[PDB]
């Protein structure tokens, strides 16, 4: 439903900002049950939570 | 029906169209529109502008 807590926990555990945290919209129900960092780690391992890749800034023009 | 004129671009200028420009030195020119007059006023060569008649006859187009 409202996964701000889950987003915060994922951002803290993954040690990345909330921008890079990807939560699966399909398994919203499964995520909402996770209220502990251990459960967040389990979801990360299962693949429901993905650390999105860093936005590309290429220096090829600069080079 | 009066005298037909030729512009910087070489087009015919019908009466009631364009403008007539006379310099101080003693030459009088006429331009079909503000585009042709502006091109003349930057001293742009007619032969290098693709849609001018002069460029067309220089490059044997058509």
């Amino acid at each position: 439903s409202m996964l701000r807590l889950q987003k915060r926990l994922a951002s803290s555990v993954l040690r990345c900002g909330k921008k890079k945290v990807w939560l699966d919209p399909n398994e919203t129900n499964e995520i909402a049950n996770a209220n502990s960092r251990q459960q967040i780690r389990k979801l990360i391992k299962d693949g429901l939570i993905i650390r999105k890749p860093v936005t590309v800034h290429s220096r090829a023009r600069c080079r | 029906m009066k005298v037909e004129l030729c512009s910087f671009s070489g087009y015919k200028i019908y009466p009631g169209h364009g403008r007539r420009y006379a310099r101080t030195d003693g030459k009088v020119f006429q331009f079909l529109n503000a585009k042709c007059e502006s091109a003349f006023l930057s001293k742009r060569n007619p032969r290098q502008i693709n849609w001018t008649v002069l460029y067309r006859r220089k490059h044997k187009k058509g």
Binding site: - | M1, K2, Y11, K12, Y14, P15, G16, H17, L32, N33, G62
Partner: protein
């Protein structure tokens, strides 16, 4: 205290109710004074502002710098399909003014004319005049009509005829025609009644109403500019840039006394869409329109005595925002109020044209037909193709057409 310098008043006090026209047509309000010695003739007409262009002609005004010289004069094209007369109104003179005496409508009213009677033609049952026209057939209604004509003949002082335009002939969206009372003059009451009675259910071409190189009056409603401030509505002086609460205003709207605002103080409000009457407009050319006797003829609209080019009055690409003109058109001199596709009323001059401005013969030498949807540079398709030669789409169309 007096104002330190004198200055003419901004704005006209002859147009003070500066408000939108309550009518869209533009009514006559003053017809030419009748005289029975003249032949029976109409006095006015309905036109539509097709657009504007310019012409080349030689002036034959002696003693001027422009004698035997060629000038360029802007003109206005007014498309005027022949009016269809459907009725007659007779008026009787009273000490209380003119009042309507008796009205007669013709049978077989045109479908477009009947639409004027309906605000919503779409859902109508189309019943208008359906019971009325049946009295043109039975003997009782016929006798009633004959008594009506006799009463008009023996009582009415002036009469008018109702003519309507032909919407199907115009390229506009609106299919609702325009009705009009046109006064008939030049003869006795019986004579004009007989002439109109002949002309019921008939078409009156514009050439039978107005003539060449004759100066007429133009009536219409101007371009509605919407709500406007004082600066544009009255052309008063702008305030200095240091002005606090507004520079496009009038600084003083009246002295302390008489403790009110005089009507003559310029104030913001509606601009344009004003019913105006313009006079002294010379008719340079009355067009003939499109014919097909064997093929379509378009030269008659734009070819002059010295051009001889098979081209129409329609400019390259048609008239801006208007369409294509195929029917009888009138080429006035100068500007005409109202936008494109705005209905206009043209009337014979109420005055006597004795000035050498008037009654001067008009001979066109060249009529511009360049495209006004931009800076047009070619008179005709033929000349444009001749100058530019073949083109890429031309080549590819020839390729598929072999």
């Amino acid at each position: 205290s007096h104002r330190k310098f004198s200055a003419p008043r901004h704005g006209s006090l002859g147009f003070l109710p500066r408000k939108r026209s309550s009518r869209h047509r533009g009514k006559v309000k003053s017809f030419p004074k009748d005289d029975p010695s003249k032949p029976v003739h109409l006095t006015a007409f309905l036109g539509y502002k097709a657009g504007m262009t310019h012409i080349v002609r030689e002036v034959d005004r002696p003693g001027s710098k422009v004698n035997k010289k060629e000038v360029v004069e802007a003109v206005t094209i007014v498309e005027t399909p022949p009016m269809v007369v459907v009725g007659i109104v007779g008026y009787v003179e009273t000490p209380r003014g003119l009042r309507t005496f008796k009205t007669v409508f013709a049978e077989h009213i045109s479908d477009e004319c009947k639409r004027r009677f309906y605000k919503n033609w779409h859902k109508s049952k189309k019943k208008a005049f359906t019971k009325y026209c049946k009295k043109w057939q039975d003997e009782d209604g016929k006798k009633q009509l004959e008594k009506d004509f006799s009463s008009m003949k023996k009582y009415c002082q002036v009469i008018r005829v109702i003519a309507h335009t032909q919407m199907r002939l115009l390229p506009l969206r609106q299919k609702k025609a325009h009705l009009m009372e046109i006064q008939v003059n030049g003869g006795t009451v019986a004579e004009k009644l007989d002439w109109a009675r002949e002309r019921l259910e008939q078409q009156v071409p514009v050439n039978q109403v107005f003539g060449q190189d004759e100066m007429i009056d133009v009536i219409g409603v101007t371009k509605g500019k919407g709500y406007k401030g004082v600066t544009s509505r009255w052309h008063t002086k702008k305030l200095p840039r240091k002005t606090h609460r507004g520079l496009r205003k009038v600084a003083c709207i009246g002295a302390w006394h008489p403790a009110r605002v005089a009507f003559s103080v310029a104030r913001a409000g509606q601009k344009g869409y004003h019913h105006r009457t313009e006079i002294n407009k010379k008719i340079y050319k009355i067009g003939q329109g499109y014919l097909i006797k064997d093929g379509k003829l378009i030269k008659n609209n734009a070819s002059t005595d010295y051009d001889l080019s098979d081209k129409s009055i329609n400019p390259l690409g048609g008239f801006v925002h208007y369409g294509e003109v195929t029917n009888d058109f009138v080429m006035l001199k100068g500007c005409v109020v109202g936008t494109k596709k705005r209905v206009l009323t043209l009337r014979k001059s109420l005055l006597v044209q004795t000035k050498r401005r008037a009654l001067e013969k008009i001979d066109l030498k060249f009529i511009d037909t360049t495209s006004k949807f931009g800076h047009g540079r070619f008179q005709t398709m033929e000349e444009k193709k001749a100058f530019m030669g073949p083109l890429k789409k031309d080549r590819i169309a020839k390729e598929e057409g072999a």
